[PDB]
Assembly symmetry: C2
Homo-oligomer: 345 residues x 2
């Protein structure tokens, strides 16, 4: 990751040199065997240069690593795919496509993998601008480095500008102030600047939806807000299945049982459920190798279901019942139907 | 309830006269049938006088309604039963029996039914002083009617003097003050008064354990504090079985499944699950009678598990994750072992 073509040439070079210095003696030269251990060594000692150069790429999430969220899926489809995959209909009914959407909800509940998912379904380039980058632009006073981000999105159209943790600055000056940060204002400028053409969609997501600039939520700007709640039983069974994908997991485990026992568990909590179960399988496998090599020389093939019990004893529901209470207060603040239901005639 | 012998005579009198005014015509006189409907009418129309006179009585909880709480059960046995059922050993080792203990923890987690249970093993008269009584004594400035309560405990010995909601007053003057309430001080006086004999045990319980008078927690006074946590899986399956006792519940309902689904649920919420399941059975059975009588004339024998789904959809985990957090912060405020573990020699 972060490897340009010259970096890949350096990778192959150092791997071939590890094969050379592993053979280490002319016919033996032609029988050199560049094995995957050499590539892993070279990859562990490759110094890449292409990091900090943000990558545009159609990501691989395929909409079922993030299960559930059916109405959220429908809103994201009708906001991203329909403008770009059926654009004749929009110019027929005169609707300008919405310039962007604003996720909000509990931290680490599948908000980043929910814009990667829609970028994959739309087959659009995905540009994640994490909170540290906005913070860096707020501290170096380099509020003109976000013009470059939007220009990169414009060239990489169709795009998904996932402004991850849009409220990083508002947390960074939580308190003489009041609104309108240095670079959030620039995001507003070059967000109102581009037309509804070019199919660039900003999906800036906020953990805290109230501290943000209220000028963001104006129409034309990130007007649609989408609550991203905690995983439902389908959503968190898909989260457990995705986190345990590529992991050798036993057949006797019931991931639906886990997903049924975990109610208030955020998506990140369900990762640390599986990354403490993988960690316990690591401990048991390595300990088994140690007690084998010291005695019988002189296996834990899979994460057994008692590892999903020892790991699940350390199950920390990270998002409280009062954080999500405030997010639902914001949600009902955003719901003002109030009697225009059964508007008949 | 609240019926003295004269009130019971009035109850039988009005029930017999309801039988008389139901017959409503000399041999028919001797054939009067005082049926349970007459007694239920008499109860619905009986004015009792013995209310507000607090009843001393060995309660009926038998430690199986309050399941789990095994270490708390051991502490309560060691604090109540051992002073009274094995008093020779205490005078042998010179230990004075503790005058009082103080429960604390989340509201409605089985604290009242946890002093009734130990009063039931002790076969001691149980005297519950609810929070409104302490508040009433704090507002009328009649702080000398708690001498009467302790005197009634002295005559009704052995006792479990459950000063329920001991921090009612501290909540009622949240804030010029600081400690040492009007009648909390009198409870301290009459608690320091009686000797460790007479076997009167004060088990006053607080929802909020920090706002209480810190002079209460001095040794000699309610020095032992016992954390009453949210129900464990055994505890809440016993709670669900106890709340559903005397109610016709199905066989195919899985109460251990309910107790396994519900983690943060306090005991009161587990009652309201059953009192919304019984209420839904009421609705369905009454609607059955209604559309039978209006059509078939011109049954829901048990609470089916589809009522324990629709009722349990309205499941409110009433105690937050930040309330029990503060109770645990107070709990290891109360644990300062700190390196004197493994004190060997």
């Amino acid at each position: 990751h972060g490897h340009v073509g010259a970096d890949l040439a350096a990778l192959c070079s150092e791997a071939a040199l590890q094969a050379i210095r592993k053979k280490m003696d002319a016919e033996v030269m032609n029988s050199l065997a560049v094995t995957m251990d050499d590539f892993r060594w070279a990859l562990s000692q490759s110094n890449p240069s292409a990091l900090r150069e943000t990558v545009v790429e159609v990501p691989q999430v395929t909409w079922e690593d993030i299960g559930g969220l059916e109405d959220v899926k429908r809103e994201l489809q009708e906001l991203v795919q329909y403008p770009v995959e059926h654009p004749d209909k929009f110019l027929k009914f005169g609707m300008t496509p919405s310039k962007g959407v604003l996720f909000y909800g509990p931290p680490g509940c599948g908000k980043t993998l929910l814009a990667k998912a829609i970028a994959n379904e739309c087959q659009a380039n995905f540009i994640s601008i994490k909170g540290p980058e906005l913070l860096t632009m707020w501290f170096g006073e380099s509020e003109a480095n976000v013009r470059e981000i939007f220009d990169k999105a414009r060239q990489a159209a169709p795009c998904v500008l996932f402004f991850d943790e849009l409220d990083s600055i508002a947390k960074a000056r939580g308190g003489g102030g009041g609104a309108a940060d240095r670079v959030i204002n620039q995001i507003l400028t070059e967000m109102d600047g581009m037309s509804t053409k070019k199919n660039v969609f900003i999906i800036g997501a906020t953990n805290r939806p109230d501290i943000i600039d209220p000028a963001i939520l104006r129409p034309g700007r990130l007007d649609q807000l989408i609550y991203i709640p905690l995983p439902d039983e389908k959503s968190r069974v898909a989260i457990l299945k995705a986190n345990l994908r590529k992991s050798p997991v036993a057949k006797d485990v019931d991931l639906e049982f886990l997903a049924k026992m975990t109610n208030g568990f955020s998506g990140a909590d369900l990762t640390e459920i599986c990354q403490r179960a993988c960690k316990l399988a690591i401990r048991e496998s390595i300990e088994s190798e140690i007690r084998r090599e010291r005695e019988r020389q002189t296996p834990v093939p899979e994460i057994r279901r008692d590892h999903f019990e020892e790991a699940m004893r350390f199950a920390r529901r990270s998002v409280s019942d009062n954080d999500i209470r405030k997010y639902e207060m914001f949600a009902q603040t955003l719901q003002q139907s109030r009697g225009f239901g059964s508007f008949r005639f």
